[PDB]
Structure 1
Amino acid sequence: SRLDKSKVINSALELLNEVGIEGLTTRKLAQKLGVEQPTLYWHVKNKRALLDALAVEILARHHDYSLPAAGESWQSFLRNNAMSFRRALLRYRDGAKVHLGTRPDEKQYDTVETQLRFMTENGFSLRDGLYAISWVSHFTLGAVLEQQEHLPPLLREALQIMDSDDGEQAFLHGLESAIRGIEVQLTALLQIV
Protein backbone atom coordinates (compact mmCIF):
# COMPACT_ATOMS: atom_id res chain seq x y z
CA SER A 1 0.00 0.00 0.00
CA ARG A 2 1.32 1.50 -2.37
CA LEU A 3 4.19 3.95 -1.75
CA ASP A 4 4.82 3.71 2.04
CA LYS A 5 8.56 3.75 2.60
CA SER A 6 8.36 0.16 3.85
CA LYS A 7 6.36 -0.92 0.75
CA VAL A 8 8.71 0.73 -1.75
CA ILE A 9 11.61 -1.01 0.00
CA ASN A 10 9.85 -4.41 0.04
CA SER A 11 8.90 -4.20 -3.69
CA ALA A 12 12.47 -3.03 -4.40
CA LEU A 13 13.91 -6.03 -2.50
CA GLU A 14 11.61 -8.33 -4.56
CA LEU A 15 12.81 -6.58 -7.70
CA LEU A 16 16.45 -6.95 -6.62
CA ASN A 17 15.96 -10.75 -6.49
CA GLU A 18 14.46 -10.75 -9.97
CA VAL A 19 16.93 -8.53 -11.79
CA GLY A 20 20.03 -8.01 -9.62
CA ILE A 21 21.81 -4.80 -8.65
CA GLU A 22 22.92 -3.52 -12.11
CA GLY A 23 19.44 -4.28 -13.56
CA LEU A 24 17.59 -2.63 -10.68
CA THR A 25 16.31 0.81 -11.77
CA THR A 26 13.75 3.28 -10.50
CA ARG A 27 11.98 2.93 -13.87
CA LYS A 28 11.34 -0.83 -13.28
CA LEU A 29 10.36 -0.20 -9.62
CA ALA A 30 7.68 2.29 -10.78
CA GLN A 31 6.43 -0.26 -13.29
CA LYS A 32 6.32 -2.95 -10.58
CA LEU A 33 4.48 -0.59 -8.21
CA GLY A 34 1.97 0.49 -10.93
CA VAL A 35 2.88 4.15 -10.65
CA GLU A 36 4.25 6.87 -13.00
CA GLN A 37 7.93 7.73 -12.72
CA PRO A 38 7.37 11.31 -11.38
CA THR A 39 5.10 9.82 -8.67
CA LEU A 40 7.85 7.48 -7.51
CA TYR A 41 10.56 10.22 -7.86
CA TRP A 42 8.64 12.12 -5.09
CA HIS A 43 9.32 9.17 -2.77
CA VAL A 44 12.68 7.85 -4.07
CA LYS A 45 14.85 10.37 -5.92
CA ASN A 46 17.35 7.97 -7.51
CA LYS A 47 18.91 4.55 -7.56
CA ARG A 48 21.67 5.61 -5.12
CA ALA A 49 18.97 6.61 -2.61
CA LEU A 50 17.18 3.33 -3.24
CA LEU A 51 20.26 1.24 -2.83
CA ASP A 52 21.22 3.05 0.40
CA ALA A 53 17.73 2.23 1.77
CA LEU A 54 17.99 -1.42 0.67
CA ALA A 55 21.37 -1.82 2.40
CA VAL A 56 19.93 -0.57 5.68
CA GLU A 57 16.87 -2.78 5.34
CA ILE A 58 18.78 -5.96 4.61
CA LEU A 59 20.77 -5.56 7.87
CA ALA A 60 17.70 -4.44 9.88
CA ARG A 61 15.71 -7.54 8.83
CA HIS A 62 18.38 -10.21 8.95
CA HIS A 63 21.53 -9.13 10.82
CA ASP A 64 20.22 -10.22 14.20
CA TYR A 65 23.61 -10.73 15.95
CA SER A 66 24.94 -7.19 15.45
CA LEU A 67 25.44 -6.69 19.21
CA PRO A 68 27.13 -8.81 21.94
CA ALA A 69 25.01 -10.68 24.51
CA ALA A 70 25.32 -10.27 28.28
CA GLY A 71 28.37 -12.15 29.59
CA GLU A 72 29.42 -13.12 26.05
CA SER A 73 33.14 -13.71 25.27
CA TRP A 74 34.68 -11.47 22.52
CA GLN A 75 35.40 -14.66 20.55
CA SER A 76 31.75 -15.67 20.54
CA PHE A 77 30.73 -12.15 19.63
CA LEU A 78 32.96 -12.10 16.52
CA ARG A 79 31.96 -15.59 15.52
CA ASN A 80 28.20 -14.92 15.99
CA ASN A 81 28.35 -11.47 14.38
CA ALA A 82 30.31 -12.77 11.38
CA MET A 83 27.91 -15.67 10.85
CA SER A 84 24.99 -13.22 11.14
CA PHE A 85 26.47 -10.73 8.72
CA ARG A 86 27.08 -13.52 6.13
CA ARG A 87 23.54 -14.90 6.43
CA ALA A 88 22.09 -11.41 6.09
CA LEU A 89 24.14 -10.71 2.94
CA LEU A 90 23.26 -14.05 1.41
CA ARG A 91 19.46 -13.42 1.70
CA TYR A 92 19.13 -11.24 -1.42
CA ARG A 93 20.68 -11.41 -4.81
CA ASP A 94 23.75 -9.13 -5.07
CA GLY A 95 23.30 -8.47 -1.35
CA ALA A 96 26.99 -7.97 -0.70
CA LYS A 97 27.27 -5.62 -3.65
CA VAL A 98 24.38 -3.57 -2.22
CA HIS A 99 26.12 -3.42 1.15
CA LEU A 100 29.51 -2.48 -0.45
CA GLY A 101 28.12 0.32 -2.61
CA THR A 102 26.66 2.24 0.35
CA ARG A 103 28.28 4.58 2.89
CA PRO A 104 27.40 3.60 6.49
CA ASP A 105 24.55 5.33 8.32
CA GLU A 106 23.84 6.48 11.90
CA LYS A 107 22.80 2.85 12.69
CA GLN A 108 25.99 1.11 11.50
CA TYR A 109 28.06 3.88 13.15
CA ASP A 110 26.12 3.60 16.46
CA THR A 111 26.35 -0.21 16.35
CA VAL A 112 30.09 -0.13 15.58
CA GLU A 113 30.58 2.24 18.55
CA THR A 114 29.04 -0.29 20.95
CA GLN A 115 31.19 -3.03 19.36
CA LEU A 116 34.38 -0.99 19.88
CA ARG A 117 33.41 -0.31 23.51
CA PHE A 118 32.79 -4.04 23.94
CA MET A 119 36.14 -5.00 22.42
CA THR A 120 38.06 -2.42 24.45
CA GLU A 121 36.51 -3.66 27.73
CA ASN A 122 37.87 -7.09 26.79
CA GLY A 123 41.47 -5.93 26.61
CA PHE A 124 41.72 -4.68 23.03
CA SER A 125 43.27 -1.34 22.30
CA LEU A 126 40.94 0.77 20.14
CA ARG A 127 43.08 0.02 17.10
CA ASP A 128 43.30 -3.74 17.49
CA GLY A 129 39.62 -3.83 18.45
CA LEU A 130 38.90 -1.94 15.25
CA TYR A 131 41.31 -4.03 13.10
CA ALA A 132 39.60 -7.15 14.45
CA ILE A 133 36.08 -6.08 13.53
CA SER A 134 37.21 -4.78 10.11
CA TRP A 135 39.08 -8.04 9.28
CA VAL A 136 36.01 -10.14 10.11
CA SER A 137 34.02 -7.80 7.91
CA HIS A 138 36.42 -7.93 4.98
CA PHE A 139 36.75 -11.70 5.18
CA THR A 140 32.98 -12.21 5.38
CA LEU A 141 32.37 -9.78 2.53
CA GLY A 142 34.96 -11.38 0.26
CA ALA A 143 33.55 -14.87 0.87
CA VAL A 144 29.94 -13.85 0.20
CA LEU A 145 30.83 -11.75 -2.80
CA GLU A 146 32.60 -14.77 -4.29
CA GLN A 147 29.64 -17.04 -3.37
CA GLN A 148 27.06 -14.66 -4.94
CA GLU A 149 28.93 -13.80 -8.15
CA HIS A 150 29.51 -17.43 -9.12
CA LEU A 151 41.45 -29.31 -14.69
CA PRO A 152 44.55 -30.27 -12.66
CA PRO A 153 44.98 -33.29 -10.25
CA LEU A 154 45.14 -31.75 -6.77
CA LEU A 155 42.63 -28.94 -7.34
CA ARG A 156 40.18 -31.52 -8.63
CA GLU A 157 40.53 -33.86 -5.67
CA ALA A 158 40.11 -31.06 -3.15
CA LEU A 159 37.10 -29.54 -4.98
CA GLN A 160 34.91 -32.60 -4.34
CA ILE A 161 34.92 -31.12 -0.77
CA MET A 162 34.69 -27.33 -1.43
CA ASP A 163 31.59 -27.77 -3.65
CA SER A 164 29.19 -30.05 -1.67
CA ASP A 165 28.46 -26.94 0.40
CA ASP A 166 28.14 -23.23 -0.43
CA GLY A 167 31.21 -21.81 1.22
CA GLU A 168 30.12 -22.17 4.88
CA GLN A 169 32.70 -24.76 5.96
CA ALA A 170 35.64 -22.79 4.51
CA PHE A 171 34.22 -19.56 5.93
CA LEU A 172 33.77 -21.06 9.42
CA HIS A 173 37.26 -22.60 9.35
CA GLY A 174 38.94 -19.34 8.28
CA LEU A 175 37.03 -17.45 10.94
CA GLU A 176 38.44 -19.74 13.68
CA SER A 177 41.95 -19.28 12.33
CA ALA A 178 41.58 -15.48 12.56
CA ILE A 179 40.02 -15.55 16.06
CA ARG A 180 42.92 -17.71 17.35
CA GLY A 181 45.34 -15.23 15.78
CA ILE A 182 43.64 -12.40 17.64
CA GLU A 183 43.69 -14.47 20.88
CA VAL A 184 47.44 -15.03 20.47
CA GLN A 185 48.17 -11.33 19.74
CA LEU A 186 45.92 -10.25 22.60
CA THR A 187 47.63 -12.60 25.11
CA ALA A 188 51.22 -11.76 24.03
CA LEU A 189 50.78 -8.08 25.09
CA LEU A 190 54.25 -6.35 24.81
CA GLN A 191 56.16 -9.64 24.24
CA ILE A 192 57.60 -10.87 20.95
CA VAL A 193 55.03 -13.30 19.46
Structure 2
Amino acid sequence: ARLNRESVIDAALELLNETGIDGLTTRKLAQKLGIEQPTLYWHVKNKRALLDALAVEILARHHDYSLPAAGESWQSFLRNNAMSFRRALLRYRDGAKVHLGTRPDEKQYDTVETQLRFMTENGFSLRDGLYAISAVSHFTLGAVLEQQEHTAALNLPPLLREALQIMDSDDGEQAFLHGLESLIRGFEVQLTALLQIV
Protein backbone atom coordinates (compact mmCIF):
# COMPACT_ATOMS: atom_id res chain seq x y z
CA ALA A 1 0.00 0.00 0.00
CA ARG A 2 1.42 3.61 -0.27
CA LEU A 3 1.72 4.93 3.19
CA ASN A 4 1.47 8.73 3.40
CA ARG A 5 -1.21 10.70 5.27
CA GLU A 6 -3.50 10.83 2.29
CA SER A 7 -3.46 6.96 1.66
CA VAL A 8 -3.88 6.31 5.43
CA ILE A 9 -6.97 8.60 5.76
CA ASP A 10 -8.52 6.90 2.67
CA ALA A 11 -8.03 3.41 3.95
CA ALA A 12 -9.23 4.58 7.37
CA LEU A 13 -12.54 6.07 5.96
CA GLU A 14 -13.00 2.99 3.81
CA LEU A 15 -12.56 0.86 6.93
CA LEU A 16 -14.88 3.17 9.07
CA ASN A 17 -17.63 2.46 6.54
CA GLU A 18 -17.32 -1.33 6.98
CA THR A 19 -16.70 -1.47 10.73
CA GLY A 20 -17.77 1.81 12.25
CA ILE A 21 -15.63 3.46 14.85
CA ASP A 22 -15.43 0.79 17.51
CA GLY A 23 -14.28 -1.71 14.87
CA LEU A 24 -11.75 0.89 13.61
CA THR A 25 -8.57 -0.54 15.09
CA THR A 26 -4.97 0.25 14.06
CA ARG A 27 -4.72 -3.59 13.73
CA LYS A 28 -7.59 -3.79 11.15
CA LEU A 29 -6.14 -0.69 9.45
CA ALA A 30 -2.67 -2.41 9.24
CA GLN A 31 -4.29 -5.58 7.92
CA LYS A 32 -6.37 -3.44 5.44
CA LEU A 33 -3.24 -1.71 4.07
CA GLY A 34 -1.47 -5.09 4.00
CA ILE A 35 1.36 -4.08 6.22
CA GLU A 36 2.60 -4.93 9.61
CA GLN A 37 1.83 -3.06 12.75
CA PRO A 38 5.39 -1.42 13.33
CA THR A 39 5.11 -0.03 9.79
CA LEU A 40 1.72 1.45 10.57
CA TYR A 41 2.98 2.84 13.87
CA TRP A 42 5.74 4.69 12.09
CA HIS A 43 2.91 6.69 10.47
CA VAL A 44 -0.11 6.59 12.79
CA LYS A 45 0.91 6.77 16.50
CA ASN A 46 -2.67 6.04 17.59
CA LYS A 47 -6.46 6.00 17.32
CA ARG A 48 -6.99 9.55 18.72
CA ALA A 49 -4.42 10.84 16.23
CA LEU A 50 -6.38 8.95 13.68
CA LEU A 51 -9.96 9.93 14.72
CA ASP A 52 -9.03 13.54 14.92
CA ALA A 53 -7.57 13.50 11.41
CA LEU A 54 -10.71 11.83 10.05
CA ALA A 55 -12.88 14.49 11.73
CA VAL A 56 -10.95 17.16 9.79
CA GLU A 57 -11.00 15.15 6.64
CA ILE A 58 -14.74 14.35 6.25
CA LEU A 59 -15.57 18.10 6.51
CA ALA A 60 -12.81 19.04 4.15
CA ARG A 61 -14.01 16.52 1.62
CA HIS A 62 -17.76 16.75 2.08
CA HIS A 63 -18.71 19.89 3.92
CA ASP A 64 -19.02 22.60 1.22
CA TYR A 65 -21.00 25.56 2.68
CA SER A 66 -18.47 26.44 5.30
CA LEU A 67 -18.28 30.08 4.20
CA PRO A 68 -21.04 32.65 3.60
CA ALA A 69 -21.69 33.85 0.19
CA ALA A 70 -21.31 37.61 -0.60
CA GLY A 71 -24.54 39.30 0.41
CA GLU A 72 -25.91 36.39 2.40
CA SER A 73 -27.78 36.85 5.59
CA TRP A 74 -26.71 35.28 8.82
CA GLN A 75 -29.93 33.21 8.71
CA SER A 76 -29.35 31.89 5.25
CA PHE A 77 -25.61 31.14 6.09
CA LEU A 78 -26.71 29.26 9.32
CA ARG A 79 -29.27 27.31 7.32
CA ASN A 80 -27.01 26.44 4.35
CA ASN A 81 -24.09 25.60 6.64
CA ALA A 82 -26.09 23.24 8.98
CA MET A 83 -27.47 21.27 6.13
CA SER A 84 -24.04 20.96 4.56
CA PHE A 85 -22.62 19.81 7.90
CA ARG A 86 -25.47 17.28 8.48
CA ARG A 87 -24.58 15.79 5.14
CA ALA A 88 -20.70 15.62 5.56
CA LEU A 89 -21.50 13.73 8.79
CA LEU A 90 -23.80 11.20 7.20
CA ARG A 91 -21.47 10.29 4.27
CA TYR A 92 -19.59 7.86 6.60
CA ARG A 93 -20.93 5.27 9.12
CA ASP A 94 -20.43 6.79 12.54
CA GLY A 95 -19.39 10.09 10.90
CA ALA A 96 -20.93 12.06 13.78
CA LYS A 97 -19.35 9.91 16.62
CA VAL A 98 -15.97 10.69 14.96
CA HIS A 99 -16.65 14.52 15.19
CA LEU A 100 -17.73 14.51 18.85
CA GLY A 101 -15.39 16.29 21.29
CA THR A 102 -13.10 17.64 18.63
CA ARG A 103 -12.12 21.28 18.40
CA PRO A 104 -11.05 23.17 15.23
CA ASP A 105 -7.88 22.03 13.73
CA GLU A 106 -5.28 24.54 12.75
CA LYS A 107 -6.15 23.64 9.14
CA GLN A 108 -9.63 25.01 9.65
CA TYR A 109 -8.72 28.21 11.65
CA ASP A 110 -9.34 30.64 8.72
CA THR A 111 -12.74 29.14 7.97
CA VAL A 112 -14.10 29.13 11.54
CA GLU A 113 -12.63 32.55 12.34
CA THR A 114 -14.44 33.99 9.28
CA GLN A 115 -17.59 32.37 10.59
CA LEU A 116 -17.32 34.10 14.02
CA ARG A 117 -16.35 37.43 12.45
CA PHE A 118 -19.44 37.25 10.08
CA MET A 119 -21.69 36.85 13.14
CA THR A 120 -20.22 39.83 15.07
CA GLU A 121 -20.43 41.75 11.81
CA ASN A 122 -24.17 40.96 11.68
CA GLY A 123 -24.83 42.34 15.16
CA PHE A 124 -23.99 39.35 17.35
CA SER A 125 -21.62 39.81 20.19
CA LEU A 126 -18.80 37.09 20.16
CA ARG A 127 -20.52 35.16 23.07
CA ASP A 128 -23.94 35.18 21.30
CA GLY A 129 -22.64 34.42 17.84
CA LEU A 130 -20.68 31.61 19.47
CA TYR A 131 -23.79 30.28 21.23
CA ALA A 132 -25.81 30.42 17.95
CA ILE A 133 -23.11 28.51 16.00
CA SER A 134 -22.89 25.94 18.90
CA ALA A 135 -26.66 25.36 19.11
CA VAL A 136 -26.68 24.71 15.40
CA SER A 137 -23.67 22.38 15.70
CA HIS A 138 -25.10 20.53 18.74
CA PHE A 139 -28.60 20.10 17.25
CA THR A 140 -27.16 18.72 13.88
CA LEU A 141 -24.82 16.31 15.88
CA GLY A 142 -27.60 14.95 18.15
CA ALA A 143 -29.92 14.65 15.19
CA VAL A 144 -27.48 12.73 12.91
CA LEU A 145 -26.32 10.58 15.90
CA GLU A 146 -29.86 9.54 16.89
CA GLN A 147 -30.46 8.69 13.24
CA GLN A 148 -27.11 6.76 12.62
CA GLU A 149 -27.36 4.82 15.96
CA HIS A 150 -31.01 3.87 15.48
CA THR A 151 -30.61 2.45 11.96
CA ALA A 152 -27.60 0.50 13.21
CA ALA A 153 -28.88 -0.81 16.67
CA LEU A 154 -31.54 -2.86 15.03
CA ASN A 155 -49.30 -2.34 23.06
CA LEU A 156 -48.38 1.17 21.89
CA PRO A 157 -50.61 3.85 23.29
CA PRO A 158 -52.31 5.51 20.12
CA LEU A 159 -50.24 8.71 19.86
CA LEU A 160 -46.78 7.06 20.37
CA ARG A 161 -47.79 4.52 17.63
CA GLU A 162 -48.51 7.37 15.22
CA ALA A 163 -45.38 9.34 16.25
CA LEU A 164 -43.11 6.22 15.67
CA GLN A 165 -44.72 5.82 12.27
CA ILE A 166 -43.91 9.54 11.49
CA MET A 167 -40.39 9.33 12.94
CA ASP A 168 -39.53 6.40 10.83
CA SER A 169 -41.33 7.62 7.60
CA ASP A 170 -38.17 9.40 6.45
CA ASP A 171 -34.49 9.62 7.36
CA GLY A 172 -35.25 12.38 9.96
CA GLU A 173 -34.49 15.13 7.40
CA GLN A 174 -37.97 16.70 7.81
CA ALA A 175 -37.73 16.83 11.59
CA PHE A 176 -34.26 18.25 11.24
CA LEU A 177 -35.18 20.91 8.61
CA HIS A 178 -38.07 21.99 10.79
CA GLY A 179 -36.14 22.17 14.15
CA LEU A 180 -33.53 24.24 12.20
CA GLU A 181 -36.10 26.92 11.32
CA SER A 182 -37.22 27.14 14.97
CA LEU A 183 -33.58 27.44 16.13
CA ILE A 184 -32.89 30.18 13.48
CA ARG A 185 -36.10 32.18 14.37
CA GLY A 186 -35.40 32.06 18.13
CA PHE A 187 -31.98 33.62 17.49
CA GLU A 188 -33.53 36.39 15.36
CA VAL A 189 -35.91 37.18 18.26
CA GLN A 190 -32.99 37.34 20.58
CA LEU A 191 -30.82 39.45 18.24
CA THR A 192 -33.52 42.03 17.56
CA ALA A 193 -34.84 42.53 21.06
CA LEU A 194 -31.50 42.78 22.91
CA LEU A 195 -32.29 45.35 25.63
CA GLN A 196 -36.04 45.42 25.12
CA ILE A 197 -37.47 42.70 27.44
CA VAL A 198 -38.68 39.81 25.14
Q: SS at the partner of 1:92?
A: coil
Unaligned runs of 5+ in 2: 151-155
Note the C-alpha offset of 1:101: 4.3
After TM superposition, give the deviation of residue 162 of structure 1 in Å: 2.0
Q: Which residue of 2 aligns with 1:40?
A: 40
Shift of 1:109: 3.7
Q: Secondary structure at the match of 1:106?
A: coil
Q: Please give the per-residue CA displacement for 1:93-138, whole angstroms capped at 9, x wherever unaligned.
A: 1111101143431134432211111011111111111110000001
Identity of aligned residues (%): 93
Q: 1:53 Cα deviation (Å)?
A: 1.0
1:5, distance to aligned residue in structure 2 (A)? 1.2
CA distance in 2, matches of 1:108, 1:99: 14
Q: What are the Cα deviations for residues 62-111 of structure 1, in whole angstroms up to 9, with x where unaligned? A: 01011111111000000011001100101101111101143431134432
Pairwise CA distance, 1:160: 2.5
Counterpart Cα distance in 2 of 1:95 and 1:63: 12
Paired with 1:103 and 1:68, the residues of 2 have a C-alpha distance of 21
- Cα RMSD for the two superposed structures: 1.2
Deviation of the 1:4 alpha carbon:
2.1
CA distance in structure 2 between the partners assigned to 1:101 and 1:12 by the alignment: 19
Q: Distance in 2 between matches of 1:65 and 1:110?
A: 14
What 5-or-longer segments of structure 1 have no aligned partner?
none
1:1-193 superposed matches below 5 A: 1-150=1-150, 151-193=156-198
Which has the higher mean CA deviation after the structures are superposed, 150-159 or 38-47?
150-159
Q: Number of residue pairs matched?
A: 193
Assess, with a 3 A threshold, how the Cα gap between structure 1 residues 2 and 51 changes in structure 2: closer, same or farther.
same
Question: Secondary structure in 2 aligned to 1:51?
Answer: helix
Higher helix share: 1
The answer (yes or no) to whether the contact 1:51–1:102 under 8 Å persists in 2 is no
For 1:49 and 1:101, the matched residues in 2 are separated by: 13
Q: Shift in Å at residue 152 of structure 1?
A: 1.6
- State how far apart, in whole Å, the 2-side matches of 1:125 and 1:97 are: 30
d(CA) in 1 for partners of 2:75, 2:57: 27
Q: Which moved more, 1:54-63 or 1:109-118?
A: 109-118
